[PDB]
């Protein structure tokens, strides 16, 4: 079965809204979310619907852009690196679980190319 999704709410976690986090939502998330290959990454992997009974036996730090979107919109993060790490965890999980050349891997690679381009232009913290 599916585990509980990653936390998007935690009142005693300290939160910030920085210019870098604003960029991560307005530029980085927005660019990847609208892409034709975004759909497998817009919500947690559903191991039941996709018939992947081993997915969460293997992937112990799941992450997806639906979770990231919620974290950004609900000001879950303290800094940009936390969010950047979530994106990189999402990509790494996909490359670890799946085989090279699979459709899902080609989709992640295209999203990751855009992610890297946008992260290269991350503004200096103000």
């Amino acid at each position: 079965m599916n585990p509980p999704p990653p936390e998007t709410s935690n009142p005693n976690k300290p939160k910030r809204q920085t210019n870098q986090l604003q960029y991560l939502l307005r530029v980085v998330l927005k660019t990847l979310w609208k892409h034709q290959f975004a759909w497998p990454f817009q919500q947690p992997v559903d191991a039941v619907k996709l018939n992947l009974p081993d997915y969460y036996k293997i992937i112990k730090t799941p992450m997806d852009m639906g979770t990231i979107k919620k974290r950004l919109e609900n000001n879950y993060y303290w800094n940009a690196q936390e969010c950047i790490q979530d994106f990189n965890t999402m990509f790494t999980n996909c490359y670890i679980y799946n085989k090279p050349g699979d459709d899902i891997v080609l989709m992640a690679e295209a999203l990751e190319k855009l992610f890297l381009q946008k992260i290269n232009e991350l503004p200096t913290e103000e």
């Binding site: 996709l50 992947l52 679980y97 799946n98 085989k99 699979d102 459709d103 899902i104």
Partner: peptide, 5 residues
């Protein structure tokens, strides 16, 4: 095999 196969 494949995720969607």
């Amino acid at each position: 095999t494949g995720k969607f196969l």
